[PDB]
Design a protein around this ligand. Sequence first.
Ligand SMILES: Cc1cc2nc3c(=O)[nH]c(=O)nc-3n(C[C@H](O)[C@H](O)[C@H](O)COP(=O)(O)OP(=O)(O)OC[C@H]3O[C@@H](n4cnc5c(N)ncnc54)[C@H](O)[C@@H]3O)c2cc1C
Ligand SMILES: Cc1cc2nc3c(=O)[nH]c(=O)nc-3n(C[C@H](O)[C@H](O)[C@H](O)COP(=O)(O)O)c2cc1C
Ligand SMILES: Nc1ncnc2c1ncn2[C@@H]1O[C@H](CO)[C@@H](O)[C@H]1OP(=O)(O)O
Length: 602
Amino acid sequence: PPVKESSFVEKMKKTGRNIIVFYGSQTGTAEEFANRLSKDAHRYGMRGMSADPEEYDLADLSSLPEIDKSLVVFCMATYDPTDNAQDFYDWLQETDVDLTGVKFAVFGLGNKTYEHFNAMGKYVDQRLEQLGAQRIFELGLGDDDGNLEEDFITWREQFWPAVCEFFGVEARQYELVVHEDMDVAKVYTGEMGRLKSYENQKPPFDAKNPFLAAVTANRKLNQGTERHLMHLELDISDSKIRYESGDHVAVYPANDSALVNQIGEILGADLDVIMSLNNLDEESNKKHPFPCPTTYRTALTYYLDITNPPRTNVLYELAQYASEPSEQEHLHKMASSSGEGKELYLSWVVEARRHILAILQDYPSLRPPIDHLCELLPRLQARYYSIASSSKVHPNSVHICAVAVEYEAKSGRVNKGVATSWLRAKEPARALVPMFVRKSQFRLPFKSTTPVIMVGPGTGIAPFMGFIQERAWLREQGKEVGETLLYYGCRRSDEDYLYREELARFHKDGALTQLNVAFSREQAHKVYVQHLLKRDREHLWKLIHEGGAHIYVCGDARNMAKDVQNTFYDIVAEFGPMEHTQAVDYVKKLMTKGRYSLDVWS
Ligand SMILES: Cc1cc2nc3c(=O)[nH]c(=O)nc-3n(C[C@H](O)[C@H](O)[C@H](O)COP(=O)(O)OP(=O)(O)OC[C@H]3O[C@@H](n4cnc5c(N)ncnc54)[C@H](O)[C@@H]3O)c2cc1C
Ligand SMILES: Cc1cc2nc3c(=O)[nH]c(=O)nc-3n(C[C@H](O)[C@H](O)[C@H](O)COP(=O)(O)O)c2cc1C
Ligand SMILES: Nc1ncnc2c1ncn2[C@@H]1O[C@H](CO)[C@@H](O)[C@H]1OP(=O)(O)O
């Protein structure tokens, strides 16, 4: 609950703004979009502004009409609503205001693999119209399972024309300030929010004031040499942090130092030059791109993203810094909605997975001002992990189960995951991992006697390591505990069976009523967790139909989770009986009555 700003409508007036793009974002992408769309109003002889719907009172849309040819755009992501867009939502639900005269557009960001695709967008664009506002352009539906960037360049290309036409209008966001005389303790060195907040830890710890927790355990859980699966233990003592199994822990990592050095090396400049990028819109909340003042090196290490494929809007803006014509032209055509330009971007940048440095190496004429480059780079996001311990057993420690990312890219070089390569490097002593916890609704039943069915192959194991530590603990405390079954899976039982001993011990003490593992490569056919579910179908239908058991799914969202959902569709279709459609509805209903929970990630 923060303090609202002044009515945005009034703000727009005082700065001559006629377009306000609102972004609902969780990992920046919706926001990045709203800002791109914002600076876009300029080329079209208009001026706009991005704004966090949380910091404003959306009831003020009703007053927007009072600005000339005013326009409001909504870039909303689904996670329904993201944290910052919750107010708006509850408002869009309670309010009954008459938005007659409001003109809007909406570009939603989602992922098709999800149950409720772009639910937020579909909702916003469909509720504004319910209130009296008129849609100016079609609802954009972004799919991060294909290419969101392309869906966005495709919408934005048909948007602006429809806008300029409708309004009859004819067809460095931040500024740089180098620091010569700066006091040493007044310089951010990587902390996230308040200055020196990292060094002087002061509760309560959240996303803006992360608690640097000490890595007390680092271990490799697998026997092979191909992959590196690891178990870490972060110590949250004196942090005053509460958590339950199912919850997630989030961490702010550090980029690889040499990938950082080499970036200032090729651009031929120093990273230690202390600076600041002050938003040219002196009245805007977001006064800076990241914590300023600070040195390039710091920003490149802690606040910027230097490994993900650059977006089309960044390449276009960097086109002007490449001498050689051929190159300049290539960077320029990366933002096409079709053609050889849309094809080089998807294969040479995306598919190839070339980070910012790579492109600078493969296009040597590109030597941009490191100043305009930092303003273009996206902020470094924190990475989530499903806490792997019960707080009833480890109140003062948060466990993480993860696989390290390192692969060969067509780009020609070996890429490394930012968070994983970093946590990998951290071992118990000087090792501090900046963190905080985010509550989720993946939870053990309210009643201990309620049955539980956990399905989670590979890393999807980790939340369940908690559910089991808790289920077991409840029994020791004399509580009466219903069935507790795990459906895990790995390649081979002597190669990457995670927590084999702990899971054996738990089965032994009777915590785990059933330990069903699936060894995928131990035979000709692939044997996956869903094969076991189909196997134990008769008994699983019993729990579901007569036991009121909860179902859980964790790990790969891409396929594993769909395959398991489909096998649950079949178990019901058979013992219902039912026809796959009535079984789907049955399984989905289980999802709304909170008896089927998902924790899948791509
Ligand atoms: C809510 C949620 C829960 C999660 N829970 C856990 C969990 O508990 N345990 C866990 O291990 N992970 C989990 N993750 C994943 C985790 O957050 C990170 O995505 C993961 O650790 C990699 O992050 P990184 O910074 O190391 O790599 P990044 O720098 O973020 O790179 C990730 C990207 O690299 C690319 N990439 C990965 N491998 C290849 C390849 N071989 N070939 C081509 N592309 C590839 C993909 O674009 C991938 O998205 C979860 C993610 C979310 C969103
Ligand atoms: C935990 C989690 C849950 C998600 N749930 C949904 C969902 O229900 N529907 C959907 O369309 N996309 C869903 N997504 C995908 C995001 O909407 C998509 O990646 C979006 O681009 C993120 O935008 P942001 O960076 O602006 O938050 C989810 C992603 C994560 C990580
Ligand atoms: N589609 C899927 N459904 C269920 N498990 C899968 C899966 N795809 C891969 N797996 C298995 O998930 C486990 C953890 O990664 C591995 O045993 C892997 O086996 P595989 O690698 O032989 O396909």
